Design a protein that fits this description.
This protein is low in regular secondary structure. It has a domain at 140-213: SH3 type barrels (Roll). Helix content is 2%, strand content 11%. The protein has one helix at 188-192; strands spanning 143-147, 166-169, 182-187, 202-205, 209-212. The longest helix is centred in the last third of the chain and has 5 residues, at 188-192. The protein is elongated, with a radius of gyration of 58 Å. It comes from Homo sapiens. The modification Phosphothreonine is found at residues 7, 23.
């Protein structure tokens, strides 16, 4: 008959908000031993003495022969006999024979023996390498030495040696930088790097090495 109407409404809205952060950590660096050194190696008093003595001598020879040995002989002796008798005397007895004999012999030989000997040689192994050494020698250098033991040296300027290695004795940058019983030398291989030997310099125990004349 008479009645209005209506229709209400509604709504809703929103928006979240994220975030973030950081997660720091920590470190614990250490310091390595630079320019490390060790105690010297004192050599023995006596090991084994030696020497060398050579000599010689000359001699002569000689010989000779002469004056032969000859000699002949010719024996001889006749004979004879006779009789007379005067009848009234019969015979019976008679002479007696004799006859002899003899013998001989001989022998000999002559062996032999052979003996030979054949030599033999061979050479020609090297074939490659592929490398190149220095051109000029290191200044101040003294002489070459030879290791007698294998001492692993791991430092910021150490010199590794192997039982039977070659090292050249060179004058370090200073004696104060040298250790007691150790000197500044360079390996033969380093020699090839003479171009930068100053960067190949190292130290090594002389007592643990031997000098090469």
């Amino acid at each position: 008959d008479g009645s209005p109407a209506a229709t209400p409404e509604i709504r809703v809205n929103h928006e979240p908000e994220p975030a973030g952060g950081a997660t720091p950590g920590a470190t614990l660096p250490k310091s390595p031993s630079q320019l490390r050194k060790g105690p010297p190696v004192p050599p023995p008093p006596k090991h084994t003495p030696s020497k060398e003595v050579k000599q010689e001598q000359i001699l002569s020879l000689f010989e000779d022969t002469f004056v032969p040995e000859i000699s002949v002989t010719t024996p001889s002796q006749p004979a004879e006999a006779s009789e007379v008798a005067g009848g009234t005397q019969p015979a019976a007895g008679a002479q007696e024979p004799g006859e002899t004999a003899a013998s001989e012999a001989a022998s000999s030989s002559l062996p032999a023996v052979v003996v030979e000997t054949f030599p033999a040689t061979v050479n020609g192994t090297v074939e490659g390498g592929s490398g190149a050494g220095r051109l000029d020698l290191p200044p101040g250098f003294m002489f070459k030495v030879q290791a007698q033991h294998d001492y692993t040296a791991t430092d910021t300027d150490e010199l590794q040696l192997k039982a039977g290695d070659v090292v050249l004795v060179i004058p370090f940058q200073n004696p104060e930088e040298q250790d007691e019983g150790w000197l500044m030398g360079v390996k033969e291989s380093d020699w090839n790097q003479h171009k930068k030997l100053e960067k190949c310099r190292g130290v090594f125990p002389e007592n643990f090495t031997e000098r090469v004349p």
